[PDB]
Symmetry: C3
Subunit: 334 residues, 3 copies
């Protein structure tokens, strides 16, 4: 702790998921204080094609909050702002951090306040962060107040046996379970302010059964034309977080070649995975090299959650077909 | 390979057998890459899933739930002829999690009743993998009506432990675990329908609760119990492959262990050892290797014991041989006095 | 045979969770027959602050039953007693044991009976044990009749790269799902005898949705004055079991530095974990060295189960704050 005042500072401009801000895989030079700013927004979001609304409580105005990237032993310095236009106290708990409830006990900010938190990123991996105000923990989390950080090793990613792993592209999929109340007639209810939905929401939460499970804040957010892109031969890192509930991601037509299912880079990755499992409260990352072009779906493989409740994204991959890997010998025919 | 080199390879036609058994195969591959041929007919049919006579309209690969296990080796080609008979009412296809491209084959295999297709893929990654039907717009409904199975892609050189020692099994069984979602009437009695389509709306409503009414092995409560128990002998090394295409499960052999478990099902990831209960996420298959050391009845269960013993996910193994008192012995059998209660 | 008959015998007095009876990490001497005695108590317990009560079926009178510690290749010899004051037959199944349904087939005792089972502890790890009477297995387990045992390697714990891990303190957290029926008004029912609750309880169980998920038998049992304690610099092993349902433990403000999430010490541990996953029917263990003082919460990180249904514990850790790891650069302010 002597001295951090002396270390280089670097200010980062955050971008909206599923993209990730600029960063280098291998650390250029020594330890830094890496600086981020996020503003909290409470706002209504519409989550499906029926006009269903949630009162979201959103870091940077998005669900999930943006991905922050630092290197191991960097200091992450966060300016967190709760504008006066908000109604609730908020804070932040980084699972990457050591002490004071992951920073939660040091960052309680009422509307009109700000705070600056610094922590040392001592363990490499992807980690969830989320709001956790005393007495209202799960309600902020399942109103979308969560995201993830990645803490890369200084030397960048490696497989289990020291071989370097370099990605071309990285995408951040935040999965969210939402619990939207229904009236006597089975229609989703609307409210005029976040606090008004509280009691009705807690009733649904206690059933443990979400009404929607979505990627990047809405059904179809990452589909069709809002689809993640790649090319045949590109190496893609997919970071996936779920702050509350388990998930089992699967790339339909592909694999996880290397999967840190626990999200922790000092634990050697599983290989050749069809479906991996990320427990509620954790983030995980999978590395894949695309081999075939076309549309891939990326899903939570409880297929009711994926296809009925919203948990499905697309990858659109360009390139030439490889008939050795797969071919239609006889097309469907009568 | 080019198409020219592929047409040159030896071809092997396999006759599939119903689960929990597995067709004849070799552990270590004899020779180089082959084209292994399988045929499956899809059958939509009513199945009875409990002793109360509860029905579902199953959508079954080869007429069973789960569909049969197909066994190939790494870098073989699997060539499937898939037939959807004109007596079925729905379109079907197949998605192999083992395959690369076109939604695991689903985008190339859409067949209406009266059609057939032939797909070929290269099995480039060793492990056990789920396959399932996946028709656009109707994906979970086909899967939770039983339209799923698994394949095993063995390493050329057979299985090894984490330290490259060979692990040779004497018997293999395949347990496919299925969550069903059977609608209930006013009186809480299970509904019956004429055709699969008639059950659709009411089934989706149950599915959205995420709560199955039955969780069964081999298509029915008690299917692998009593005289249908799996069998082994003391000293025998058994591989149990287990799949769940939709929902998590946590298998456990009551009275035994998983000595080597590929809980993710993938043989390049080293197995976990000495497991009491292992976890297979929905959408995957896993495999456990065990050597029986004690005779008697064992139960093999999903260890959410409500799913095992109330909803149906329990099977038996009956194991022959001599008892080992060093491993366990009753020092004092239940005894005492007969008291009022 | 003679060999087995001549082994030394050690009687161990059990202690209630979350504490653990005295033992040595490294075995002192060669194999022994370790003797334990447990009496089964069926009794009414209060599980929340609303006075909800359940008829518990408790090994040694506690939920969970106590942790038994032996080392690999010791024999565990258990005397299990079903007092004449009880109403139901009970038995025991050790997942650590080989044969006769884990011992369940050899230990079926009516009230007024006792039995003694010996088994060889051949595999190292933490393992669940639970009651399992034929045809009523889940009902005894979710009435609290489960615990865990720990079979230490002879050489004590290691990180698998061979380095010794020596803990200063060990705590045992047993997590229990309860399924308490409600009447027409939504108020939890009370019953005269445990048999009276059976039909109503099985109906709740079939929903797969617990009414309460608690640590150490009640909401708040390990919070406030009953928090687990440690100091900065101490190494703590937390053994956690769940006999029926999955859990995802997380130390808020900390990590699992080494986690045997499967509970088996010949499988090398995961490292740097944020949240780990223990499937229903298993026990796991996490090893952590505290670095910061203060309150920590230890939770199931489905936060609805943690903060709404009861699955949250506290650690109170003494020592000096380390500003290098974390610091409030600017405290909450306008
Ligand atoms: O392979 N996706 O269900
Ligand atoms: O060990 N069977 O629950
Ligand atoms: O990090 N606590 O949820
Ligand atoms: Cu908040
Ligand atoms: Cu958290
Ligand atoms: Cu189908
Ligand atoms: Cu799939
Ligand atoms: Cu009992
Ligand atoms: Cu058990």
């Amino acid at each position: 702790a002597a001295e951090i005042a002396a270390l280089p500072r670097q200010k980062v401009e955050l971008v909206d998921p599923p993209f990730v801000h600029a960063h280098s895989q291998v650390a250029e030079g020594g330890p830094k204080v890496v600086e981020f700013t996020m503003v909290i927004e409470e706002k209504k979001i519409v989550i499906d094609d029926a006009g269903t609304e949630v009162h979201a409580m959103a870091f940077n105005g998005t669900v999930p909050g943006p991905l922050m990237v630092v290197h191991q032993d960097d200091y992450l310095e966060l300016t967190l702002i709760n504008p006066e236009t908000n109604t609730l106290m908020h804070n932040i708990d980084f699972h990457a951090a050591t002490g004071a409830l992951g920073g939660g006990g040091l960052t309680e900010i009422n509307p009109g306040e700000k705070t600056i938190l610094r922590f040392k990123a001592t363990k490499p991996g992807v980690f969830v962060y989320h709001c956790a105000p005393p007495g209202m923990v799960p309600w902020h989390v399942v109103s979308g107040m969560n995201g993830a950080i990645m803490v890369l090793p200084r030397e960048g990613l490696h497989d289990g046996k020291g071989k370097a792993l370099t990605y071309d592209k990285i995408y951040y999929v935040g999965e969210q379970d939402f619990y939207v109340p229904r009236d006597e007639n089975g229609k989703y209810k609307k409210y005029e302010a976040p606090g008004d939905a509280y009691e009705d929401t807690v009733k649904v939460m206690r059933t443990l059964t979400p009404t929607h499970v979505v990627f990047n804040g809405a059904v179809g957010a990452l589909t069709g034309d809002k689809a993640m892109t790649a090319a045949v031969g590109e190496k893609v890192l997919i970071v996936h977080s779920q702050a509350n509930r388990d998930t089992r991601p699967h790339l339909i037509g592909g694999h996880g070649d290397y999967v840190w299912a626990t999200g922790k880079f000092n634990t050697p990755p599983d290989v050749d995975q069809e479906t991996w499992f990320i427990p509620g409260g954790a983030a995980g990352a999978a590395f894949y090299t695309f081999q075939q072009p076309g549309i891939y779906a990326y899903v939570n493989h409880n297929l009711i959650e994926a296809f009925e409740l919203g948990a499905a994204a697309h990858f659109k991959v360009t390139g030439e077909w490889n008939d050795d890997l797969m071919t239609s010998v006889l097309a469907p025919s009568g």
